[PDB]
Every structure is written in structure tokens, then in C-alpha cells.
Write a protein that binds this ligand. Sequence first.
Ligand SMILES: *[C@@H]1O[C@H](CO[C@@H]2O[C@@H](C)[C@@H](O)[C@@H](O)[C@@H]2O)[C@@H](O[C@@H]2O[C@H](CO)[C@@H](O[C@@H]3O[C@H](CO[C@H]4O[C@H](CO)[C@@H](O)[C@H](O)[C@@H]4O[C@@H]4O[C@H](CO)[C@@H](O[C@@H]5O[C@H](CO)[C@H](O)[C@H](O)[C@H]5O)[C@H](O)[C@H]4NC(C)=O)[C@@H](O)[C@H](O[C@H]4O[C@H](CO)[C@@H](O)[C@H](O)[C@@H]4O)[C@@H]3O)[C@H](O)[C@H]2NC(C)=O)[C@H](O)[C@H]1NC(C)=O
Ligand SMILES: *[C@@H]1O[C@H](CO[C@@H]2O[C@@H](C)[C@@H](O)[C@@H](O)[C@@H]2O)[C@@H](O[C@@H]2O[C@H](CO)[C@@H](O[C@@H]3O[C@H](CO[C@H]4O[C@H](CO)[C@@H](O)[C@H](O)[C@@H]4O[C@@H]4O[C@H](CO)[C@@H](O[C@@H]5O[C@H](CO)[C@H](O)[C@H](O)[C@H]5O)[C@H](O)[C@H]4NC(C)=O)[C@@H](O)[C@H](O[C@H]4O[C@H](CO)[C@@H](O)[C@H](O)[C@@H]4O)[C@@H]3O)[C@H](O)[C@H]2NC(C)=O)[C@H](O)[C@H]1NC(C)=O
Lengths: 13, 208, 207
Amino acid sequence: DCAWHLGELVWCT
Amino acid sequence: GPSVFLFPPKPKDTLMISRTPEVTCVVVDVSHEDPEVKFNWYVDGVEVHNAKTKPREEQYNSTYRVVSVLTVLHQDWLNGKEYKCKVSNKALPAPIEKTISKAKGQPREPQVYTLPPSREEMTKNQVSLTCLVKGFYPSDIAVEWESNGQPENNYKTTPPVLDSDGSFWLASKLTVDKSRWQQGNVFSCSVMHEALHNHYTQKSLSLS
Amino acid sequence: GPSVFLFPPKPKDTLEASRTPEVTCVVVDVSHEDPEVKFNWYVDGVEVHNAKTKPREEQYNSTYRVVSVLTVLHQDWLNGKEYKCKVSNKALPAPIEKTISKAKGQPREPQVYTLPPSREEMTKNQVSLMCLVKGFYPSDIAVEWESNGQPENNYKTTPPVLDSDGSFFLYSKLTVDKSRWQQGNVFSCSVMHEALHNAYTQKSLSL
Ligand SMILES: *[C@@H]1O[C@H](CO[C@@H]2O[C@@H](C)[C@@H](O)[C@@H](O)[C@@H]2O)[C@@H](O[C@@H]2O[C@H](CO)[C@@H](O[C@@H]3O[C@H](CO[C@H]4O[C@H](CO)[C@@H](O)[C@H](O)[C@@H]4O[C@@H]4O[C@H](CO)[C@@H](O[C@@H]5O[C@H](CO)[C@H](O)[C@H](O)[C@H]5O)[C@H](O)[C@H]4NC(C)=O)[C@@H](O)[C@H](O[C@H]4O[C@H](CO)[C@@H](O)[C@H](O)[C@@H]4O)[C@@H]3O)[C@H](O)[C@H]2NC(C)=O)[C@H](O)[C@H]1NC(C)=O
Ligand SMILES: *[C@@H]1O[C@H](CO[C@@H]2O[C@@H](C)[C@@H](O)[C@@H](O)[C@@H]2O)[C@@H](O[C@@H]2O[C@H](CO)[C@@H](O[C@@H]3O[C@H](CO[C@H]4O[C@H](CO)[C@@H](O)[C@H](O)[C@@H]4O[C@@H]4O[C@H](CO)[C@@H](O[C@@H]5O[C@H](CO)[C@H](O)[C@H](O)[C@H]5O)[C@H](O)[C@H]4NC(C)=O)[C@@H](O)[C@H](O[C@H]4O[C@H](CO)[C@@H](O)[C@H](O)[C@@H]4O)[C@@H]3O)[C@H](O)[C@H]2NC(C)=O)[C@H](O)[C@H]1NC(C)=O
């Protein structure tokens, strides 16, 4: 899964 | 003679795969008579060659500022790699060397808790939403607030404080018109830190 | 030659009638060949002669550390008087002068709010009791904790942070064993500030 911040990509595992 | 200062990447750059972290080697007091500066860079002792020199900048005080920038991999930095800049110049009896890296030590996961305004604060024009972040290591972090996808910018966050167990804590306070709190708006604290899953967590807060 | 650093009194000393606040003039890099330091103090430019010199101290890096300490009255400090230390020594071309006073600007009363632990925290060995202090000016303040008249020492407090309205705020965090919290004990955050009533307030928190 993946994490976004205000539509911007943070990190995916 | 010239002096050197080496600076880490921004935490946010090392934690967002969409950004580009870099380390920066700044040479101040460069003479007009010997402006030529040579940089060697090393990573855990091994020379790398992909650095790039920024445009030369003359200063108010009749000396140059020269700057080398080295891009780095998110994971190298977060895995604690050591980056060394070595600076050579005719006005230097001997090259100068500086090194920097993440702080040493086992990383620990921040615990993130949101705290509503005190009942006593309920008489004011504005109220305080608190985000407590504790038990985290190393101290490199980013905290931001938002509601309905848009950034809420009217907040202030304390520097990290060293706690008694060797981890760090801080608090972030966001100030909103009481009526916005009363209208049931949901507010969210966003924390980014290496030892989080996908480097990111978000905790919400609304009128109960 | 020598270097001078002038230091304020502790906020707690100026805010408790019982303690003795003082202003401290530290001279470092005093040479072995010329250890004699002359101190002149002035209060709003008026020279005073009640300062006391501390015992001289060898640093073992070629130099002495020399300290003059000036007692000051609580209200002179709080009333914003300015204290000046002037240091003369044969290794200086000219005496060095430094000054210090309380920060300037309208004093403002701290707002003290206590925040219980989050429900999410209730699965841990220990919980966090928060004391939010905000809207205070100047930044000089002291925060402590207690319970059943007894001092609770397991806390950390952030430095004052400048807020968007020109006042400061801080947080203090007291960590207690969850069981103590669940059992109904009352914990108190005590704040000392110039702009408080009797320069003191205390706010209470319990399950
Ligand atoms: C001739 O003049 C120059 C120029 O001076 C400037 O202009 C004049 C008119 C004055 O107004 C100055 O105040 C101006 O700076 C003099 O150059 C100065 O020399 C100083 C030492 O003599 C040096 O001090 C050291 O500063 C460190 C922090 O510097 C920061 O912050 C300051 C101010 O906040 C800023 O001016 C500096 O440029 C520097 O800023 C950082 O730059 C880095 C690298 O670019 C940034 O990081 C990067 O950012 C990018 C995106 O932007 C990206 O994220 C990258 O990944 C990332 O790497 C970083 O974000 C910037 N930070 C900020 C806050 O802006 C101190 O740490 C250092 O202290 C250490 O050493 C001390 C010993 O001296 C110890 O006491 C201490 O313990 C520390 O170990 C020093 O204080 C100044 O920085 C320097 N100014 C500049 C602009 O370079 C020059 O001295 C003078 N010569 C003579 C003979 O008079
Ligand atoms: C020879 O050695 C000496 C001594 O140093 C020690 O021994 C050597 C061998 C080493 O082992 C050191 O590690 C040891 O410390 C060297 O002396 C040093 O010189 C420095 C100047 O070059 C000087 O730096 C300046 O420090 C200021 C802060 O000083 C504070 O905090 C430091 C450390 O955080 C602490 O060491 C100091 O003692 C001082 O602490 C405060 O003292 C005051 C005065 O007592 C206390 O206030 C009083 O407290 C009592 C209660 O007891 C009462 O309440 C009174 O009412 C109250 O007034 C206060 O509580 C103490 N605070 C703390 C935190 O402990 C900096 O602010 C300053 O920075 C400013 O200036 C810079 C430029 O100079 C600017 O860049 C900057 O922006 C600032 O404006 C300086 O950094 C060191 O303090 C000093 N060390 C000592 C012990 O004095 C000497 O350099 C060396 N010589 C040679 C040739 O090598």
C-alpha cells in the first residue's frame, strides 16, 4: 500500500 | 582563509519518494585572487563523482560563496550513510573536510495523539487543537495540519524535546475560530517520520 | 583579550518573594599574566557598589573565569530596569560594556489549560498529562507539577514558542503510570508568571 500527502506521493511499501 | 559548512537534506525530502534530497557543501570567504575551489565527495569512505557546482555568487564583503550539491538516495540517507565533503584551495595550507549523517541510533515509531480544546478554552474567540507526538527517534520529523484536503496554515509546532527514555517529543498547536470547531469541521494532524509505516500517519480531531 | 557574558536572573527567583534574583557578569579568557578585573555596575546608568565577586576559578586552558554577581530587587527587575556591567582589564584596549533588562512590551496573562490523555494512549504502561500555557508575555515563566501536596518530578517542558499574535506558548508533559490515572488521583500544573494574580496559578486534572 501507499501513502499520499495533499495529493503528493510519500512512500509505498 | 576560506571556511566550510556542510548541511543535511531536509527531512521532508528524505521521506517523500516524490522529492529529491541533496547535501550541500558551502565554501565562504573565497578570495578574489584565488577563486578556484576543488571538491572531492565520499560516501562511507568511497569517492563519488556526481556532485554539481552551483553558480558562483559574489558577496557584499568582497569574497565569493562557492557551493557544491550532491544528490542522495532516500534509503542511503535513512540507512545512516556518511557523506564527506573535502575542499581544496590555494589560500588553504591544507584541505578541509567535514562529514555528516543521520543521527546514530535505533529508530523508534512516533506515537501520535490528538487532543481537543480544554472545556475552559470554550469561552474564547479561538481555540487550540493539540497534536502530541512522543517516543520517536531520530529527531528528524515533519508535522502539518489540514481539513477537507486543504492545508490549514495557522499552527505552530515546538522544537523536539529529549525525553527521559532517550526518544524525542513535541506538540503541534493549531488555532481555529471557535465557530469552525462548533460547525463540526474535521481537522487532521499529519506526521512524517522514518519509523512510521510508509513514513506517514494522520490523526483526526472533531467536536465530540 | 577577555570576553564578557551577562546573564539574567532565573524566572523563578524574580517571581517567588522568598528567592533572591541576581544578575551575573561572567568574564572568560582572563590571562594568567593579568588576572585583575575591574567591574563597574550601573542601574539605568546610575553606578552602584553592592556587587559581590565570586572566587576566581582556574580553567586549565591558560585562563581564569571571573564572576561578579549583582543582587537585584524583584520589582526593579520586573519594572524593567536596565543593568549594565563594565569590565576593564589590561589586555583590553577599552573596557567592555554589556546591558540586560527584561524584554520590552505589554505583559499578558498566561492562559493555562490541562489536557487529559487520549483514549488511544490507554493501552500503554504510562500516560501523558498535558499542560498548555499560552498567550503570555514576556517569555519568562516557570512550570511545575504536583499531587496530594507532593511534588511530581517526572515531567518535561518545551521552551516558550513565539506565537502568531506576538505572545508565547509552551507545553509541559507529565508522564504517570496508567494505574495512577485510572484510580482517580488529581494532578496539578502550577505556573509562575508576572502577569498572573499573585504571580501564580494552578490548574487541576483527574479521571
Ligand atoms: C562575508 O559575508 C558572508 C555572507 O554573509 C551573508 O550576508 C551578509 C550581508 C550578512 O547578512 C550575513 O549574515 C549573511 O549570511 C559571510 O558568510 C557567513 O559566514 C558564517 C560564518 O562566518 C556562516 O555561519 C554559519 O552558519 C550556519 C548556518 O548557516 C545557515 O543559515 C544562515 C542564516 O540562518 C544562512 O545565511 C546560511 O546560508 C545557512 O543557510 C543554510 O544553507 C543550507 C545550504 O544551502 C540550507 O540547506 C539546503 O537547503 C536546500 C534548499 O534551500 C535543500 O533543502 C538542501 O538539501 C539543503 O542542504 C539550509 O536550509 C540553510 N539554512 C537556513 C536557516 O537558511 C551555522 O550552522 C554555523 O554554525 C556552526 O559553526 C559555528 C562556528 O562558526 C559554531 O558556532 C556552531 O556550533 C556551528 O557548529 C555558522 O554560524 C554563515 O552561514 C555565512 N553566510 C552565508 C550566506 O553563507 C562571511 O562570513 C563573510 N566573511 C567575512 C570575512 O566577514
Ligand atoms: C577555557 O575554558 C572555558 C570554560 O569552559 C569549560 O572548560 C573548558 C576546559 C571546556 O571543558 C568547556 O567545555 C567547559 O565549559 C571557556 O569558557 C567558555 O567561553 C565561551 C565564550 O568563548 C562561552 O560561550 C558562551 O556561552 C553562552 C552561554 O553560557 C552559558 O551556558 C554554557 C553552556 O550552555 C555554560 O557553560 C555557561 O556557564 C553559561 O551558563 C549559564 O551561566 C549563568 C551564569 O552563572 C547562569 O545564570 C545564573 O545562574 C544562577 C544559578 O546558579 C542564578 O540563578 C543567577 O541569577 C543567574 O544569573 C545560567 O543559568 C547558566 N546557563 C546554563 C545553560 O548553564 C552563550 O550564550 C554565548 O553565546 C553568545 O555569544 C556568541 C558569541 O560569543 C554568539 O554566537 C551567540 O549568539 C550568543 O549571543 C557563548 O557561546 C562559554 O560559556 C564559556 N564557558 C564557561 C564555563 O564560561 C573558554 O572559552 C576557554 N578558553 C580558551 C582559550 O579555550
